[model samples]
Target: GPKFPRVKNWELGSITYDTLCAQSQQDGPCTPRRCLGSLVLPPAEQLLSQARDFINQYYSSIKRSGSQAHEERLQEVEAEVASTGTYHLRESELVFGAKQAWRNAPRCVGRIQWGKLQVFDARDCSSAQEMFTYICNHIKYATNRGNLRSAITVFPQRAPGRGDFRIWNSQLVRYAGYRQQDGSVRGDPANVEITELCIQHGWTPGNGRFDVLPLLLQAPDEAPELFVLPPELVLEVPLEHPTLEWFAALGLRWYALPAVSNMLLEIGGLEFSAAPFSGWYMSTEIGTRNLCDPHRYNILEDVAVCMDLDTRTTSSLWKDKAAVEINLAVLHSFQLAKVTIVDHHAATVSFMKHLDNEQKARGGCPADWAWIVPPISGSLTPVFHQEMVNYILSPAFRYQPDPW
Candidate 1:
């Protein structure tokens, strides 16, 4: 194989940041002044694309036929692609890129489906083959339930009781009704026939009806798995504190990775987890700009969905003090997969006084809790199903680093 001529001064540290900036001002040759513009180093996005493509090829080959020849070929391709794209060889790396690298692995981000990625825990699963088998079973089981029933059972709505706002006689079971540990009583199940009960009550999603699958069936003989909170994943509930506000803002931190496998990690319209923002494919715009490896984000996107909030200042009510609206649907969808909210009450008096002016306008579910919709889950789409298989079974990420 003919080797491409290596750039003599391609080393990253060969040029200092200051010198690069100065060179940008004075035009000599339009040669790349920054580490990114220089063609010698590959962009994270390109590396990620290469990794993803390699996996897709494997998937295509497997779909056609199965043989020792095919398996060996896949292993060779996987090894080749992984060795080619991985940047761990570099000492100085950026956390964001590092996260993306994991996401882009053949099994992790390759599937590009919402729920499977979330379930896989950002590519920390076993082999892609195993993941595909599990995903196929999960979907097959869920699909057997059919649509209408699946929706209601996926996340059922909670009935109101003490503290929660709603009528007492709701057909749905309140969250409190579950046994000490959530389980089913067959033959005479207390929980209503989910499909019939939901249709009878005209239930919609967002009301918390989640489908409960047995751990034995999903992973068999596995002691039930319990997801723990990573220090970075937890958010502190706030009370008049600045730091508390910052924690509240922690909701969307994953968007900073290199590429996003999908909009949100979800299955049946519920969320699971989010990989770091810069880690997945959608982060191309951001990664193209940020070049440092092992460094923090110099710039971050302002917000995915913006909001306009009315702030109450001592002087008067400030109209439109910049606010950000969270796409709860998308965010929650991500929640269902892996990587894994707020309130304000006061101002109620003024709102109620204003509401009284319009009798009909005040009608409808009045309590804050009334806003929750019923749980209506759906099957993962084909793309997501394949992706899910990749996430939990991919070999590239099965090697977890030691916990410090």
Candidate 2:
């Protein structure tokens, strides 16, 4: 038996149907199963590292040469169309009986079938890096793809060509030399053998360009069209787009403010970074009822006394006797200092004084009702107020909101 060198390859023709599903959901052409009130990606370096690791782990480990390797190769396949068109290393590409002439043969070749790098509010042409790195991480050359997880989906997505599974892939960027009957990849009508990656919804697809996040937050209307294909009867935009028609359509509120901030940074052509707890401003829900007041003096005292000073993010809080209002007929009034920090510097300072002492004295205060919706008369504490409103409002704090 002549020796054959090992090679690994896999393919999906063009799985873009799911991208359309995600698109229709965004364009009002269809309903989204889940609206992305905020879609956030970790730092570029983190994403790039994960993708690089995925390729090294899966693509470089497969042995695709001998008859005995067939079973191992078959197990690596995550999904296959005819299960025959795409297979392992070809004998013609091998040269066990030859010299150094074949050492330069392509180390790996993979067809994404559909892939994209869409950056919301990215001003630096993020598509190039987005897709390139995505493909770099997701392309798997393995003998057991089914059991492996790459940088992309860790779990099983639907088979390609199926609804919602069809419209996305890394191969779409590559033109096949022949025509696909489904009209999937028309870039080179003669190239039918190439793969394509479907466009994920809310993502503006692009092939290549320089990569960078924007610094300004462009309103939805000002946003450039990210992509348009398959006749583009549809429009896709991030839900965080300011015009908000896209967000309002889905009825999602209380989205993490950080999402919008990131988008803003992308639009501004700014680099996005955050503290470990930067997500503090990432708004999850708004108007949570029955939530106890978070900034009461007692709560602040307990937090200050019990919490380690190094662990605490804030330290100005204390009982200010001078600021507390006292009325002849009522208890003390609530006193709070209002300060705003921007880029770790104080930008503004104020106070919201005189909570309820005067009114309590005149109205003869009542305090029994708790957990009831109506305003607690005679209450001396402040109502719901954000301790770090400036972070969310300041341009410098975009993507790095307070608590970071």
Candidate 3:
């Protein structure tokens, strides 16, 4: 086998040649240690680097000298961190940083639309009710009646001596989970904790698989409050196959939008604890991971039985067959509903093109091979064969603590 020469670059960050080769195996699950460990810079260090880059990039884009402004801003950041331990971004800076974060997100295959992201500034919101209002508006705009557009509604920044504004729902839209008598979950397992929180907060829990969880909003200095989502704002696709008439009978459906509410938006040494960002779905995300994972719906056995595959033996490759069919059904159903979704094959090809574009614009592109490769057909995708480098870039979205 010819060596796929691992070229490492230090300008953006560092990725070892051996690390790139290790990811090519595609053997099993992507352990966080291997995949996520590539870019683990300290929070403050990452933000400072990102701030300088963003400041230079912003000024360069406008074709004007901002050296004085950048110097003053750096001083401001230094003073704020010295006293308050963090800094704030101007509204324009926030917008630019949010978009850059999306562009820098290593796991996303939809970065082709990064520049078009709609940024809603909700930093002035100061109460749980106000936070709920922002969330409702975010859902409405991001959903866009199936013509989904990427959007993020950013709340207040995390600061010392203050509580943070947070959304407890994993996504702006998610099904409720009910623990059943058989020690099994009846709905989305991911929402089990949030669902219980809703119930504890006095919202009536539904007994169906597709019950949408309400918003559990928490503002600084205020207890969490439950707010039911307006049914009209949450768009759902009732899943069915193109040819299999009985597929609809499975009662499997998912939200049209995937608005991640729990992630932190880190920019210029400040953290937006309640920044809910959304993008249209990539089918495999819903089909393979959400519905097929054992801790999730675990529906492979039922799907295999429906397809009349030999579920009794691993040699039959029944799980693989069922997963493919399920993914096909998801793509078909979303298309038939006029909902926006990208198939894994098309997404990967676009990502490759994105890589080429980034290489021309910037010197390199940061990518996590484990995530960029499609969950279902790994080897068939071009990304699987291509060597990739992972590095830390500024204006980034990061996982944060759950509000509880």
Candidate 1 vs candidate 2, TM-score winner = 1
**TM-score: the better of candidates 2 and 3:** 3
Name the runs in model 2 displaced over 4 angstroms.
Answer: 1-258, 261-285, 288-395, 398-404
State every prediction's TM-score relative to the real structure. 0.18, 0.15, 0.87
Distance from true location, Cα of 197 in model 1, Å: 18
- In the range 167-238, model 1's lDDT, one tens digit per residue, is 111211111112223453221122334323333344331322222211111112222221111222222111
lDDT for predicted candidate 1 compared with the true structure: 0.24
Highest TM-score model number = 3
- Tens digits of lDDT, candidate 2, 342-381: 1100111111121123123211111111211112211232
Off by over 4 Å in 1: 1-218, 221-223, 227-319, 322-404
Candidate topping lDDT: 3
In order, what lDDT does every prediction score?
A: 0.24, 0.20, 0.82
lDDT of 2: 0.20
What lDDT is reached at residue 3 by model 3?
54
| Per-residue accuracy of model 3 over 190-238 as CA lDDT, tens digit each | 8888899999999998899889998899999778998998899999999
